[PDB]
């Protein structure tokens, strides 16, 4: 798992927020950035990297249209038969999982006689100013290139096992687009569920670092690493990406 | 018993949904009765139900139970908590139906040895000899704090578009912000103990051996709820959760702390605990408090800093 | 006798239900007549029945009675209050049926010596020589306060789903919010005293010895009702209760306070008590008031802070 | 004499059951005709009988008489108001039966000395030489107000279940809510006075001595009725009561106020009282009115606040 908190400085949609002051609480209307305007950039960067490194890319997703496999017309264009029953569903997923990388890392849904679902392996949220915009991101790399539907083994899983390493490497590499004036950045790599503190407070890196060890001790974990960037301490996001790839 | 009250702050949120209208996804809303200076009023405010929390708790319990070697049922190994309500689950898991009332006890014990979830979370089977087992963890809705005259909550709708190169694509999602509060209760004294009344049946010694492990796992499971891992639409609507105030009480007698509505609900529950220990002839009463907002607390009460510390402390005792 | 009136504020609750229609669980509702400036109107509002409160009180009484060493019946040891209505309960407990009217007294004493529940809560046996014993605690429905022109209550339905991986699962639950009020009465001067008329029967001296302990336990049992431990569906629909105003009167003569409908039901009942002590030639009258909402109370009346204080003060006198 | 008209408001009520059908208890109801522009309708509306009120009044009189030292009969010490009506009751009490008509007065006095209830409540003895005596208090049916174009009275049925662990237990109860009105008469001038022509017999001096206390007790017994201590099923279905309007007139000649049906029945009874006092050569005639529903009163009337003040003023005169 890779869980991170990012603070930004940048110098129209509005949303309501509940804000805390000494007198109590208030309701305010503040400009925001939607949670799907960030997923598109990440998925586009993933497409570019996967094509550059020889990984399979879907026919429709080769163009920057992420309809994926929602409609039967998309099924006809891509050229994959629709699922027949619940038992066949797993097979279908493998096929969908063996042609398009985006349908694996980012998840997908097909609705019809035998709907098939696969939740995203990357989870994002809205961007709210602390303007000092801040947000957080979460990824579970332990499930990339792993079938999620429950069923018997199907032919072709050997190719998935072979390509798992490159798929995970590409998914890790793809975060460079989202991470790219950065002010404060915290990244945590664990083997147990964990959520870093948001960037609402000036002193949050210390709090999450302190909580990391206690969480590892209480959850019977075996790996927990943290990385901090302020403008272990690094200088550029490229070094952080290289370290994440190496470790 | 371990009881507690928790106060949360969540922004730009949609964790619970309801049936959609047109191209609009609706956030759950409910009516609440509030007291102002002018009298009593009725309002409609967004809420979050109490069955998402139970689902998250049971999922974390399944994960921990499989991690530490405790048995886990077949269907509940998948995150599908039908438990043992229908006959299809019984056929899949491989447990015979109860014959009479006298056999009922046996059935429960058998079930009680195959899945921890059917033990901690309780279950129900309906038929010739219905068998019931109330959940050992009790949860409630997530309501915004009814403090003052103005509710600190808001709800709106947002507009989203799918992009395509051959138009022939538009939807709306409801988003809320609130100061959520909720209380919980878990009686660890009855975990891994049969609730049906009858005669002793072979297989309860193994039940007694695992009691410490089951209690430890059940206590460890609460980290998920106290940390904020529940709900849906977390892929693109990840909430910005935060903890503000928390009170946990460990007692040997029935007790319930004050709901986190009023700004002073820690002092009141501490005083009520001090008096209730005497009036009910108790022999144990401990309080743990987490305060991150700066409200009045009291005296003679342990003060912590995080949730892992509370989990460790509850495990130790 | 000890009488009282209590006001509660409850949100997002379903404590009493009724027969379901389709996939919908219905909350209990009842008609009320309310006086408005335009005249008189009839309305339908959610209510909570008055028997669940009796069940909660009797369960707490069973717990305390077993804790402090008082005898408890066999069937009432489990929380099944059939008492002694049917012949099967008598066969299980081990008591012979009364033969004639004259033996009736004896029967009661025997039943009165095995179960505190059959004493405090009253019972009935129907047969050749029927035996009746009125309950020593009296309760009624929980109704929203009929104050002003608009009833401060609301009821709605919510939509819930069960999850599966192989669709082949949807239900609806009614949830209410209200400002509930109810009053109670308990005559401790008749606890552990036979009610059927006849001649003295061996076994009444032991009854006289335990009178103080029985009265102590009966007064202690009110803590559950006054704290809010009753109702159903508490596992996932745990309500958010709160106490606003409460008045309790201890007298030696029959008396009943004003129902908690109008904003001024404390001053009126205190004045009524002051006059009623004189009119009926009484010799004792005490009042205890808990006021959290800030309404007019009066003068020369004790002001408390919690419920445990009231329980201790009731025990002392 | 003292006469009165009273208007009550009651919610979630069942004080008068009737023959149950199956597992359902039905309320007592009566037919009325409501006139409309289209035509007429026959509605069925809840009522409360007048015998229950008499039983409550007699029980309260028994309590007060035994508390102040007045003689109370052996059977009437228990709440079995058979009175000295049959030979068995006389044998139990120990009074010789009357021999002929001439001794009848004698017998009455003896009865009138042994029991207070037999005097105020009245008795009848059937036998060879019947002796009769009319009650000194008269009470009418409790029927809601047929005022305006609507009948503010509603009646529903509710569902209750007994819970058990070995199913093999369901009942229904009707609950009503209405705006009740009733009127009553009490002739205190004839209390402790024999009701048969004849020469004075020994023992009337004791009656003359006890007359003041007997009248005082009879007046005091009205407080229970006017406070709401009548009916049945009070243990679990304790009703909620409130007083809206009351007019009680103390006169020296026969008179009764207007029924509390019209919204203006205070003015009319004042006018009728004036005319009757003028035409019958009366010397004292006073009116006491308790007003809570804001109706027109008039001039020439004493305005009270509660029922205790009314009882005190009745005692003084």
């Amino acid at each position: 798992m890779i869980s991170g908190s990012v603070r930004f400085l940048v110098n129209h949609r509005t949303a309501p927020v509940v804000l805390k002051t000494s007198t109590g609480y208030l309701v305010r209307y503040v400009p925001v950035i939607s949670g799907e305007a960030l997923a598109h950039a990440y998925q586009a960067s993933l497409v570019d990297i996967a094509k550059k490194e020889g990984l399979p890319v879907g026919s429709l997703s080769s163009q920057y249209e992420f309809i994926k496999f929602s409609t039967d017309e998309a099924l006809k264009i891509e050229g994959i038969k629709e699922p027949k029953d619940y038992n066949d569903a797993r097979r279908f997923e493998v096929e969908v999982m063996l042609k398009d990388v985006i349908a694996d890392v980012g998840g997908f849904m097909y609705a019809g006689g035998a709907p098939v679902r696969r939740t995203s392996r990357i989870k994002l949220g809205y961007m709210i100013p602390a303007a000092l915009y801040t947000f957080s991101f979460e990824l579970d790399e332990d499930l990339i290139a792993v079938p999620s539907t429950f069923g018997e083994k199907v032919k072709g899983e050997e190719e998935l096992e072979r390509q798992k390493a490159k798929r995970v490497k590409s998914a890790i590499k793809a975060l460079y687009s989202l991470l790219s004036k950065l002010m404060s950045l915290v990244v945590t790599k664990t083997d147990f569920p964990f959520m870093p503190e948001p960037a609402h407070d000036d002193d949050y890196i210390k709090t999450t670092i302190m909580r990391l060890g206690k969480a590892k001790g209480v959850l019977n974990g075996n790996l927990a690493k943290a990385y901090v960037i302020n403008n272990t301490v690094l200088s550029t996001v490229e070094d952080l990406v290289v370290k994440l790839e190496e470790e | 018993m371990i009881s507690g009250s928790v106060r949360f702050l969540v922004n730009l949120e949609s964790l619970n949904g309801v049936e959609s209208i047109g191209n609009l996804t609706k956030h759950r809303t409910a009516p609440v009765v509030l007291k102002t200076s002018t009298g009593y009023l009725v309002r409609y405010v967004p809420v979050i139900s109490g069955e998402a929390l139970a689902h998250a708790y049971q999922a974390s319990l399944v994960d921990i139970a499989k991690k530490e070697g405790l048995p886990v049922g077949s269907l509940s190994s998948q995150y599908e908590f039908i438990k043992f309500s229908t006959d299809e689950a019984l056929k899949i898991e491989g447990i015979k139906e109860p014959k009479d009332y006298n056999d009922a006890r046996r059935f429960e014990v058998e079930v009680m040895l195959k899945d921890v979830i059917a033990d901690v979370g309780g279950f129900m089977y309906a038929g010739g000899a219905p068998v019931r087992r109330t959940s050992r963890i009790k949860l409630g809705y997530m309501i915004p704090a009814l403090r003052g005259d103005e509710i600190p909550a808001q709800l709106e709708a947002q507009f989203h578009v799918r992009f395509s190169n051959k138009p022939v694509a538009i939807f709306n999602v409801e988003v809320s912000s609130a100061l959520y509060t909720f209380s919980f209760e878990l009686d660890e004294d009855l975990i891994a103990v049969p609730s049906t009344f009858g005669e002793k049946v072979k297989g309860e010694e193994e039940l007694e051996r695992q009691k410490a492990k089951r209690v430890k796992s059940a206590i460890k499971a609460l980290y998920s709820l106290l940390s904020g891992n529940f709900g849906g639409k977390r892929s693109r609507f990840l909430p910005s959760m935060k903890l503000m105030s928390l009170v946990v009480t460990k007692t040997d007698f029935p007790f319930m702390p004050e709901p986190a509505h009023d700004d002073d609900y820690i002092k009141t529950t501490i005083m009520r605990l001090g008096k209730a220990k005497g009036v009910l002839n108790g022999n144990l009463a401990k309080a743990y408090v987490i305060n991150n907002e700066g409200i009045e607390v009291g005296e003679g009460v342990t003060v912590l800093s995080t949730v892992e510390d509370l989990v460790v402390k509850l495990e130790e005792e | 006798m000890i009488s009282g009136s209590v006001r509660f504020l409850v949100n997002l609750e379903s404590l009493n239900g009724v027969e379901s229609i389709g996939n919908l669980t219905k909350h209990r509702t009842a008609p009320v007549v309310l006086k408005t400036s335009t005249g008189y109107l009839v309305r339908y509002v959610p209510v909570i029945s008055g028997e669940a409160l009796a069940h909660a009180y009797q369960a707490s009484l069973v717990d305390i009675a077993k804790k402090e060493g008082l005898p408890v019946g066999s069937l009432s040891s489990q929380y099944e209050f059939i008492k002694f209505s049917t012949d099967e309960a008598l066969k299980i407990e081990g008591i012979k049926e009364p033969k004639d009217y004259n033996d009736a007294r004896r029967f009661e004493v025997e039943v009165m010596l095995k179960d505190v529940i059959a004493d405090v809560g009253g019972f009935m046996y129907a047969g050749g020589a029927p035996v009746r014993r009125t309950s020593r605690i009296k309760l009624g429905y929980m109704i929203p306060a009929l104050r002003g022109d608009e009833i401060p209550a609301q009821l709605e339905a919510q939509f819930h789903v069960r999850f599966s991986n192989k669709p082949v699962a949807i239900f609806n639950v009614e949830v209410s919010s209200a400002l509930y009020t109810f009053s109670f009465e308990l005559d401790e001067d008749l606890i552990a005293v036979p009610s059927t008329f006849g001649e003295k029967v061996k076994g009444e001296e032991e009854l006289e010895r335990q009178k103080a302990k029985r009265v102590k336990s009966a007064i202690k049992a009110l803590y559950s009702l006054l704290s809010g431990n009753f109702g159903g569906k508490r596992s996932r629909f745990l309500p958010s209760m709160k106490l606003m105003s409460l008045v309790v009167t201890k007298t030696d003569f029959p008396f009943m306070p004003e129902p908690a409908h109008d904003d001024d039901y404390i001053k009126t009942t205190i004045m009524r008590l002051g006059k009623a002590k004189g009119v009926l030639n009484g010799n004792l009258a005490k009042a205890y008031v808990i006021n959290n909402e800030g309404i007019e109370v009066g003068e020369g009346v004790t002001v408390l802070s919690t419920v445990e204080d009231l329980v201790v003060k009731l025990e002392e006198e | 004499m003292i006469s009165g008209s009273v208007r009550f408001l009651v919610n979630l009520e069942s004080l008068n059951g009737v023959e149950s059908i199956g597992n359902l208890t039905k309320h007592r109801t009566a037919p009325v005709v409501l006139k409309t522009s289209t035509g007429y309708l026959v509605r069925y509306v809840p009522v409360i009988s007048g015998e229950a009120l008499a039983h409550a009044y007699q029980a309260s009189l028994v309590d007060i008489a035994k508390k102040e030292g007045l003689p109370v009969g052996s059977l009437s010490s228990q709440y079995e108001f058979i009175k000295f009506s049959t030979d068995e009751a006389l044998k139990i009490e120990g009074i010789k039966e009357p021999k002929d008509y001439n001794d009848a007065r004698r017998f009455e006095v003896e009865v009138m000395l042994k029991d207070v209830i037999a005097d105020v409540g009245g008795f009848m003895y059937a036998g060879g030489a019947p002796v009769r005596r009319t009650s000194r208090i008269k009470l009418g049916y409790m029927i809601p107000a047929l005022r305006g174009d609507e009948i503010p009275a509603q009646l529903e049925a509710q569902f209750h279940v007994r819970f058990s662990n070995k199913p093999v237990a369901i009942f229904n109860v009707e609950v009503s809510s209405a705006l009740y009105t009733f009127s009553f008469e009490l002739d205190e001038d004839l209390i402790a006075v024999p009701s048969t022509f004849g020469e004075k017999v020994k023992g009337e001096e004791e009656l003359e001595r006890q007359k003041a206390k007997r009248v005082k007790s009879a007046i005091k017994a009205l407080y229970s009725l006017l406070s709401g201590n009548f009916g049945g099923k009070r243990s679990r279905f304790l009703p909620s009561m409130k007083l809206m309007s009351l007019v009680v007139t103390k006169t020296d000649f026969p008179f009764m106020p207007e029924p509390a049906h019209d919204d203006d029945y205070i003015k009319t009874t004042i006018m009728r009282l004036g005319k009757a006092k003028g035409v019958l050569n009366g010397n004292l005639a006073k009116a006491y009115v308790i007003n809570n529903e804001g109706i027109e009163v008039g001039e020439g009337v004493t305005v009270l606040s509660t029922v205790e003040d009314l009882v005190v003023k009745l005692e003084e005169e």
Binding site: - | - | - | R28, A30, P31, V32, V33, K35, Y40, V42, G50, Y101, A104, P130, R132, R133, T134, S135, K138, L139, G140, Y141, I143, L146, S183, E185, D189, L190, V193, S195, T196, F197, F253, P254, F255, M256, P257, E258, P259, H261, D262, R272, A276, V279, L280
Partner: protein, 211 residues
Amino acid sequence: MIYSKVFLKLHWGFSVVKPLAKPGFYLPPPTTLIGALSYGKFRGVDNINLGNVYGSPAYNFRNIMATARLESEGVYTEDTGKVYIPNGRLVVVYVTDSISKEELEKLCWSITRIGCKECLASVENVEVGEAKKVSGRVKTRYYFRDTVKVVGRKEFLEYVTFWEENGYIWGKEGSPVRYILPITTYPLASKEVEVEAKEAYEVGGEYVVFS
């Protein structure tokens, strides 16, 4: 011969059960009316010596003519028969010559119950005057005897059985006399009937028929 009209506002109704399963009467018999009148004079006594038997304090008043009729709509119910007519109105006519106007008016303004104890009844107003004896064709509303000949259509006739004064003594049954009422059975009401009475008394625009 003088007469007095009285208007009564009944509280909840009235009920007089039949002699010798306890059905009631649609309208109160004259004996109840005479007793309600006698209440004003003999209050406080329940037994008197008539000379040979203790009959009732109302035996003396047994030569006063009295009739009554409805003015609203009520319902008869068997749930001991009862007549529910709350807040209704009743009109009673007292025709006599044995007492002066003062006695009749004083006794008439002193009526409190008709039937049994619970049947309270207020008095609204009375009117005292003189009546004229007639024998021609008349139109009447009050109930009369059976022997009165009727010329109209037999469409609103009810038949009842009442008793004479001989029923004022305990342990004895009043003599049976059939009466005819112009009443609609359901809902209860009264309608006018034209008759050719041999002897009727005009009492102010309503020809009361007696024989």
